Design a protein around this ligand. Structure first.
Ligand code: CLA
Ligand code: CLA
Ligand code: CLA
Ligand code: CLA
Ligand code: CLA
Ligand code: CLA
Ligand code: CLA
Ligand code: CLA
Ligand code: PQN
Ligand code: PQN
Ligand code: SF4
Ligand code: SF4
Ligand code: SF4
Lengths: 124, 740, 80, 180, 140, 98
């Protein structure tokens, strides 16, 4: 997919990036613009969705946070596993995490006092 | 170019002074915390952290310019006063050698009158090392009346600047349009300030030189000195002291310039009468600089259409490795008040160091080379000034990527590349630092091992012949043969530090052909090590200030922030301001080693005495021919033998330089309280004291809290430097007075 | 990796996911609060533990705790 | 537990808050206080070994007497272990006194500056590792990281201790055996 | 024509993907020609030249600058320290293949070809220290 | 010792070997720096070295600087001239076509 062009190397051709899981984001980009990578200088944003490679998860979420402040665009980030497993970890509900959703659940939640008592009565 | 003034914008009222923190609504409504007390002063000078209207930020910094300028004028107007009311400048004008400098007296209150150093000239006091007497003698000042008139004339100029910084603001105010005239700004700074400044002082030392040159160097009493106006009211007096003044601006138009050769010369070297550079070479020098600045001050677009401009100049420079090079740099410097300050602090900071070097190399003032305390003090003075200034250049070149850099507005692909291949710049500098460290200080470990081990230092003598007198020796030889050959109009070298075997002595050695050897290659590379590390950490803070690999959302946090948290293994001290905080420390180590090198090597091989039965006998006779190669000699013959001149002074008048010496270690080790502990433990420490304060209700409304995480480090470096300069300040001012 | 435990002090002002870098927590409908939201962290395997939610956490004693546990590639935030 | 970094840089800051941080703070006072007792005890014998007791009870009242007559005069045979002429027996000790100030000041690297700066620098080193040809074939096992916030202070305390211990372990032998 | 072909292709047709001073388009081919990672060869030869290059100059430093450098015997101190460090370095380099154990199917860059180049490195280092050994003897 | 002319493609080792010769002329000066190795190298070469060797700064060692000064002067003259050609190369070059 047409992606922004960047010069300066650094990010690409890293063995660790090849052997480790990589992140792939995308954005609508209805208009030609110019933005900045969280790890690079400046680059021109082309029309349509744009797929890039990222080596860190915080790098994958800070770019989405930066895009939301510019214009109003829904963001999609997909997180791939080492072999070839591609799972949708960002927006599995497709609803924005701060806003309220219907699909609700509780993971790792202790409902005890506040000073301590670290024992968990039930994990699920 | 247009007179666009916004007359009356801010009124003159004491209302804002009644509110502590009027400059920020965040620092006004909630003063309920001790931390607010420190935030009121930490952000008091961070003018870009208040309002964003550049028409007001430019109308808050040019105000601080005139304010600081008024402070400097109040500071200078007192120096002419102290050298008249209680001093010895007139007696020193008659007898310059036996009378030590002094311009500060103490009072009989608690027995402190022991500080009244017996300097001579019928006046006792405290010795001075500011170069005031040399500057005043080079200015033709003789009588005390000429001091008071200059001081009273300084009060007027000092008041006018307060009524100016209070004029273009509470009374007047130029628009924002008056500041994008950078083209019109360099046409008045390089021609009106630099040009007319280098010309006005040039026209002074042509008619004021003979009260110093053709009088005070002959042997006339200060009472027999005529008046400066008696030489101008009668052109024939100037004509007799210089047989070129009879013409009086007649061959100046005829282009018969050679007829003005009695004051305008290019001799070189020093004068064997005064003790410094020639009084006639500096006049011609400033004339040559003045005309050059009158030409260089016409380079940018005014309002007539001719000349270049910072715009298209940078819009034209390209380059293969640069890509879209130099373009947009105009928008970089014309929009961010900050952006100009780093290049200024960088150039002017290196400038103070370079001029410090030019001080001791060729002494420009009469009776300055023999005055060893003043010379030693002035070099290291400007040395540390430029150290602070260059680190401030890094402090703000780090500000730019965070506060005023955008991926749409201002653009240079050169700066883009400095941030695109940013991981390569520091990688190069890193390997350079390590190579210059594991060897330069590695060889120190090596030689210090060779001595304590035995016969290894003996076999190191042949290597001691290496490196030293191998490089830079031919450069000095070039300068020996530079006059006559590559300088037909020069009868002397650039300085007598270049001319071999040529020694100029005026009862005390002024300059020496600094014969490098033994360990100058060692200390110069200790310098280069501490220079590359300083440039590395500061340039790291510059270009990593925007895009960081660890935390991608770096621009959100800020510049003077603590960190992020215990995540990622530990994110701690990652701000560019901390690269400056530690950058101040490696600059500290750099300037410390440089001042050590300069100071001690001087009396090692340069500074000394002369007798007729022999030749040259130094204060400390050629010691660092061996005591510099190892670390031990730097505290066996250097840091050890200095206690005999700083402590053995209580029986004399140099007792204060011992108290400050031993007391500067106190505040330095007091910095070891903040640079090692954490706010968490100390915040648990207040709440117990606040419990005792809640027991008697003596708890203040202002809730006691610990210092900020960043403020603690700012105070820590403040004490590490203050306690880390006042010791060598007391040391440089200890021996040089006893061995003067 | 790190162990995320949510106190009962929650007000549901979404301060977690607003502050949080890689979205460890998540807002879930709950029947025992004023605003009606509760923070929950399913992706605790990806948590780094930067402790920026305790800053934005309003309560007297914070409502979102993350006790320091083991360290893996997901919790070190390294790109290699 | 006992050894943990902080609670979070917020709510004013929790820098050095664990009980282990209190231990790491306490060791600093231990070395200096136990060194005060020794600096005092080192005069109550060298003043009578030379027989001139009138030095102490007259000059030790002020700190400058502690500076000029102990840290300077007694250190003459120490530093003169290997002079630029004839080195003698007190060479190995005069070397240790320097190697001490090295190790001691080496600790100042781990104590004054924290850990994140080293993370951002080690990442550049790792980048240069795989990017450089020939050397790209060499690969490590455990990923290079900086010391833990707890282990940083502990290892730096190890340096601040042993360097200080050797700082006083080389002065005693040489300075006492030089003049007896 | 969008932006007129990337401001002059970022100046006269740079390109140079695997070049930026790591190895020029001539030097990257020189690396393929270089025997340390030479194409079309396996067992011994990928090494061998490694030792014949390293051990050849390992005689250098300790002949003129080593801890022994002031008598006539000092021509041997440059070789004893070199050969001792050669044995140490050979063990240290051979241990890398023992640490690696993931690419047992890729025998070249992992274990088999790795030892089948360090095997040449041993004879190369020792022999190369002996090759430059007999080069300065006729002039002395 | 020879001209080393052969192919037009041999025109890229021609900027390669002098590129090594510059560094070789630098390294040759670097390797002959020891104050003790100069006495043993100059005896066989010169007839003057029989009576005594080493001329310090009297003649032989200034030849290096007296070899640099002409080369610097040559390059200075050629660039001062190049600034006066006003966009027209008046010096022949062995390029164009192959
Ligand atoms: C920043 C410039 C500066 C500094 C550092 C000093 C420092 C000093 N002055 Mg001085 N003075 C100055 C400017 C300055 N003066 C100016 C511009 C004038 C008017 C021309 C005077 C006129 C003056 C007189 C008449 C006298 C002094 C005296 C003194 C000494 C006594 C200390 C004191 O009472 O003042 C206070 C010092 C401070 C508040 C600290 C320094 C302030 C900086 C900015 C911080 C002292 C060392 C007295 C003296 O030496 O006795 C003979 C004395 O009688 N001064
Ligand atoms: C509060 C005490 C005090 C005061 C007010 C002054 C004031 C002054 N001293 Mg002084 N000095 C002092 C203590 C003091 N000194 C002590 C204890 C010593 C050691 C014996 C010296 C040694 C000394 C020397 C060697 C010289 C001076 C000089 C000066 C004058 C230069 C201006 C200046 O330095 O501005 C202040 C400088 C600052 C860095 C303060 C500003 C920074 C903030 C406000 C702190 C000035 C009037 C110079 C002179 O020529 O005398 C006329 C000179 O050469 N002093
Ligand atoms: C090429 C620039 C240049 C140079 C080499 C000098 C050199 C010199 N100046 Mg000078 N000066 C200059 C520009 C320069 N000046 C300009 C533009 C002004 C107008 C503001 C002045 C105003 C000035 C005054 C009022 C005085 C001097 C003095 C001196 C002499 C001693 C001071 C010193 O060492 O600092 C040297 C400064 C620099 C090396 C920085 C200049 C570098 C520029 C930016 C290039 C010295 C030989 C003193 C003197 O006359 O000695 C008796 C003196 O009192 N200068
Ligand atoms: C005597 C104590 C000491 C010693 C031996 C060192 C040694 C070193 N420091 Mg360090 N440093 C110290 C104190 C010390 N530091 C203190 C107190 C601080 C706090 C201000 C720092 C802050 C600091 C920073 C921020 C950096 C260093 C770096 C370095 C390394 C430079 C690379 C090199 O040349 O290797 C030579 C080996 C020897 C000379 C032995 C080096 C090993 C730099 C680095 O990591 O390399 C680029 C680096 O960026 N230091
Ligand atoms: C043509 C008139 C002229 C004259 C009479 C002088 C005279 C002097 N200059 Mg100067 N200079 C000049 C032009 C002149 N200069 C110009 C056009 C520049 C470039 C803008 C400089 C830049 C300069 C610097 C940077 C320095 C001097 C310095 C000096 C003093 C050192 C003495 C010396 O070695 O001689 C001449 C000095 C030279 C450096 C050689 C000539 C200048 C260039 C490099 C040739 C001396 C009094 C030194 C000084 O300020 O003393 C502290 C110093 O560091 N000059
Ligand atoms: C409450 C505990 C305590 C106390 C009372 C002191 C007291 C002192 N320390 Mg110390 N220090 C401490 C804890 C303490 N320290 C700890 C825990 C450490 C870390 C282990 C240090 C590390 C340390 C170092 C590294 C140094 C000191 C030094 C000093 C002396 C400074 C001399 C001075 O100016 O005094 C007052 C004397 C005057 C003349 C007053 C000056 C008056 C002016 C002119 C006004 C001083 C007596 C310094 C020293 O002197 O070395 C022995 C030194 O360099 N300390
Ligand atoms: C408790 C003993 C003790 C301690 C902790 C110190 C500590 C220090 N001394 Mg000190 N010194 C001592 C005893 C001590 N000294 C004694 C007994 C004497 C003889 C009286 C001296 C004489 C002395 C001098 C003359 C100087 C120091 C300096 C320094 C500082 C070095 C600055 C630096 O690290 O930059 C880097 C330094 C190097 C890389 C070397 C440092 C904080 C220097 C200083 O304080 O500069 C402001 C300095 O000039 N000391
Ligand atoms: C770079 C300068 C420097 C530095 C950083 C130090 C640092 C130190 N010195 Mg030292 N010292 C120095 C120069 C220096 N010294 C010189 C030039 C001499 C004279 C030769 C001495 C003589 C000296 C003595 C006699 C002693 C120290 C001791 C100490 C340690 C005591 C620290 C404390 O707080 O108490 C400390 C690490 C003390 C020590 O050994 O630690 C317990 C000690 O007894 N120093
Ligand atoms: C002591 C200390 C504090 C506490 C620092 C404090 C409390 C500063 C105290 C300074 C003030 C100026 C002293 C109180 C004096 C009052 C202002 C009263 C003055 C009234 C008249 C004398 C004018 C920290 O916050 C801290 C944080 C991180 C690492 C180390 C430390 C640390 O060591
Ligand atoms: C250099 C440095 C590192 C990096 C430290 C590293 C990479 C450790 C390097 C160790 C090398 C391998 C040498 C270790 C060998 C020692 C000379 C002796 C140890 C041998 C036994 C005692 C175990 C940090 O992690 C750090 C963290 C927090 C504050 C400051 C710093 C800091 O200054
Ligand atoms: S930080 Fe606590 S109170 Fe705030 S929204 Fe999250 S769970 Fe609710
Ligand atoms: S532990 Fe760190 S990453 Fe996880 S939710 Fe809290 S602040 Fe965010
Ligand atoms: S609270 Fe202190 S130890 Fe913890 S991350 Fe912040 S600076 Fe580091």
């Amino acid at each position: 997919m047409p992606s922004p062009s960047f010069l300066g190397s650094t990010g690409g051709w890293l063995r660790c990036a090849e052997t480790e899981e990589k992140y792939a984001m995308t954005w609508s980009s209805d208009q030609q613009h110019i933005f900045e990578m969280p790890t690079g200088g400046a680059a021109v944003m082309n029309s349509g969705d744009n797929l890039l490679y990222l080596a860190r998860k915080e790098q994958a979420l800070a770019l989405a946070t930066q895009l939301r402040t510019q214009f109003k665009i829904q963001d999609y980030k997909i997180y791939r596993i080492f072999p070839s497993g591609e799972v949708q970890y960002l927006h599995p509900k497709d609803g924005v995490l701060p806003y309220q959703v219907n699909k609700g659940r509780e993971q790792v939640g202790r409902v005890k006092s506040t000073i301590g008592k670290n024992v968990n009565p039930a994990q699920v | 170019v247009k007179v666009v003034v916004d007359r009356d914008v801010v009124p003159t009222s004491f209302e804002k002074w009644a509110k502590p923190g009027h400059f920020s609504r965040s620092l006004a409504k909630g003063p309920k915390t001790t931390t607010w007390i420190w935030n009121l002063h930490a952000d008091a000078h961070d003018f870009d952290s208040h309002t964003s209207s550049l028409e007001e930020v430019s109308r808050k910094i040019f105000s601080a310019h005139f304010g600081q300028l008024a402070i400097i004028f109040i500071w200078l107007s007192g120096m002419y006063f102290h050298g008249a009311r209680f001093s010895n400048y007139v007696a020193w004008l008659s007898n310059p050698t036996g009378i030590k400098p002094s311009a500060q007296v103490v009072w009989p209150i608690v027995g402190q009158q022991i500080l009244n150093a017996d300097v001579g000239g019928g006046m006792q006091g405290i010795q001075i090392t500011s170069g005031l007497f040399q500057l005043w003698r080079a200015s033709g000042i003789v009588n005390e009346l000429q001091l008071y008139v200059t001081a009273l004339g300084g009060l007027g100029m000092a008041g006018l600047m307060i009524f100016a910084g209070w004029f273009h603001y509470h009374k007047a105010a130029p628009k924002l349009e008056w500041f994008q005239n950078v083209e019109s700004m360099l046409n008045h700074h390089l021609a009106g300030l630099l040009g007319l400044g280098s010309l006005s002082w040039a026209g002074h030392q042509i008619h004021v030189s003979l009260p110093i040159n053709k009088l005070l160097d002959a042997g006339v009493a200060p009472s027999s000195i005529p008046l400066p106006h008696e030489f101008i009211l009668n052109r024939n007096l100037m004509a007799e002291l210089y047989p070129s003044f009879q013409q009086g601006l007649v061959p100046f138009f005829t282009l018969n310039w050679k007829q003005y050769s009695d004051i305008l010369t290019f001799k070189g070297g020093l004068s064997p009468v005064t003790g410094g550079l020639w009084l006639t070479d500096v006049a011609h020098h400033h004339l040559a600089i003045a005309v050059l600045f009158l030409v260089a001050g016409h380079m940018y677009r005014t309002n007539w259409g001719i000349g270049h401009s910072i715009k298209q100049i940078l819009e034209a420079h390209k380059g293969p490795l640069t890509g879209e090079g130099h373009k947009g740099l105009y928008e970089i410097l014309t929009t961010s008040w900050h952006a100009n300050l780093a290049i200024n602090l960088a150039m002017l900071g290196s400038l103070s160091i370079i001029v410090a070097h030019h001080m001791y190399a060729m002494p420009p003032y009469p009776y300055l080379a023999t005055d060893y305390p003043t010379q030693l003090s002035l070099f290291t003075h400007h040395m540390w000034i430029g150290g602070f200034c260059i680190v401030g250049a890094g402090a703000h070149a780090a500000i730019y990527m965070v506060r005023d850099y955008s991926p749409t507005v201002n653009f240079n692909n050169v700066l883009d590349r400095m941030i695109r291949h940013r991981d390569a710049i520091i990688s190069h500098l890193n390997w350079v630092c390590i190579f210059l460290g594991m060897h330069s200080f590695g060889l120190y470990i090596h030689n210090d091992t060779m001595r304590a081990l035995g016969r290894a230092q003996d076999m190191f003598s042949d290597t001691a012949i290496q490196l030293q007198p191998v490089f830079a020796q031919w450069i000095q030889q070039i300068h020996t043969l530079a006059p006559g050959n590559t300088a037909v109009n020069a009868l002397a070298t650039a300085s007598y530090a270049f001319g071999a075997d040529t020694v100029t002595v005026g009862s005390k050695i002024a300059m020496m052909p600094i014969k490098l050897g033994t360990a100058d290659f060692m200390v110069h590379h200790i310098h280069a090590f501490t220079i590359h590390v300083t440039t590395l950490i500061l340039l790291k803070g510059v270009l990593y200030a925007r895009n960081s690999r660890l935390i991608p959302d770096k621009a959100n946090l800020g510049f003077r922030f603590p960190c992020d948290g215990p995540g990622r293994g530990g994110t701690c001290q990652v701000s560019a301001w901390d690269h400056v905080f530690l950058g101040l420390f490696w600059m500290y180590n750099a300037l410390s080693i440089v001042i050590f090198h300069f100071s001690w090597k001087m009396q090692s091989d340069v500074w000394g005495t002369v007798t007729s039965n022999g030749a040259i006998s130094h204060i400390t006779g050629g010691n660092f021919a061996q005591s510099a190669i190892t670390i031990n000699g730097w505290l066996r013959d250097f840091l050890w033998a200095q206690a005999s001149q700083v402590i053995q002074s209580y029986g004399s008048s140099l007792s204060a330089y011992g108290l400050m010496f031993l007391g500067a270690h106190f505040v330095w080790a007091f910095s070891l309280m903040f640079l090692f502990s954490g706010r968490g433990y100390w915040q648990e420490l207040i709440e117990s004291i606040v419990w005792a304060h809640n027991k008697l209700k003596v708890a203040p409304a202002i809730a006691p809290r610990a210092l900020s995480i960043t403020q603690g480090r700012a105070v820590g470096v403040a004490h590490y430097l203050l306690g880390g300069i006042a010791t060598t300040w007391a040391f440089f001012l200890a021996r040089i007075i006893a061995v003067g | 990796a790190h162990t995320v435990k949510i106190y009962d002090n929650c007000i549901g002002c979404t301060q977690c996911v607003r502050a949080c870098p890689l979205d460890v927590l998540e807002m879930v409908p709950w029947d025992g609060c004023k605003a009606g939201q509760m923070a929950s962290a399913p992706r605790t395997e990806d948590c780094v533990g930067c402790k920026r939610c305790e800053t934005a956490c309003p309560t007297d004693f914070l409502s979102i705790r993350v006790y320091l546990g083991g360290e893996t590639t997901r919790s070190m935030g390294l790109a290699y | 537990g006992y050894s943990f970094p902080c609670d979070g840089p917020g709510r004013g800051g929790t820098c050095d808050i664990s009980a282990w941080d209190a231990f790491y703070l306490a060791m600093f006072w231990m070395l200096n206080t136990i060194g005060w007792v020794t600096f005092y005890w080192h005069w109550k014998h060298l003043s009578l070994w030379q027989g001139n007791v009138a030095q102490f009870n007259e000059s030790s009242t002020y700190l400058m007497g502690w500076l000029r007559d102990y840290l300077w005069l007694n250190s003459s045979p120490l530093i003169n272990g290997y002079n630029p002429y004839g080195m003698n027996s007190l060479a190995v000790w005069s070397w240790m006194f320097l190697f001490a100030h090295l190790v001691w000041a080496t600790g100042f690297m781990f104590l004054i500056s924290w850990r994140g700066y080293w993370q951002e620098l080690i990442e550049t080193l790792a980048w240069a590792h795989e990017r450089t040809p020939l050397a790209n074939l060499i690969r490590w096992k455990d990923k290079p990281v900086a010391l833990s916030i707890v282990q940083a202070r502990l290892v730096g305390l190890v340096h601040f201790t042993v360097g200080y211990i050797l700082t006083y372990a080389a002065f005693v032998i040489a300075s006492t055996a030089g003049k007896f | 024509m969008t932006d007129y072909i990337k401001p002059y292709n970022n100046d006269p047709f740079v390109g140079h993907l695997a070049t930026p001073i790591n190895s020029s388009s001539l030097t990257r081919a020189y690396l393929s020609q270089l025997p340390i990672y030479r194409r079309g060869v396996s067992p011994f030869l990928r090494g061998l030249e490694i030792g014949m290059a390293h051990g050849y100059f390992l005689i250098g430093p300790f002949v003129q600058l080593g801890p022994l450098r002031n008598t006539d015997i000092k021509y041997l101190a440059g070789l004893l320290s070199a050969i001792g460090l050669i044995v140490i370095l050979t063990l240290g380099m051979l241990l890398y293949g023992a640490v690696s154990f993931t690419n047992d199917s890729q025998d070249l860059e992992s274990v088999d070809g790795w030892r089948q180049l360090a095997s040449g490195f041993l004879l190369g280092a020792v022999g190369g220290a002996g090759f430059a050994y007999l080069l300065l003897t006729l002039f002395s | 010792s020879s001209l080393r002319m052969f192919e037009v493609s041999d025109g890229e080792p021609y900027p390669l070997n002098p590129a090594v010769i510059f560094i070789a002329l630098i390294g040759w000066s670097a390797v002959a720096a020891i104050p003790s190795n100069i006495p043993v190298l100059g005896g066989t070469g010169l007839t003057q070295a029989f009576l005594a060797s080493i001329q310090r700064l009297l003649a032989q060692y200034p030849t290096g600087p007296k070899l640099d000064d002409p080369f610097w002067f040559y390059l200075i003259v050629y660039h001062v001239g190049l600034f006066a050609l006003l966009i027209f190369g008046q010096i022949g070059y062995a390029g164009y076509a192959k």
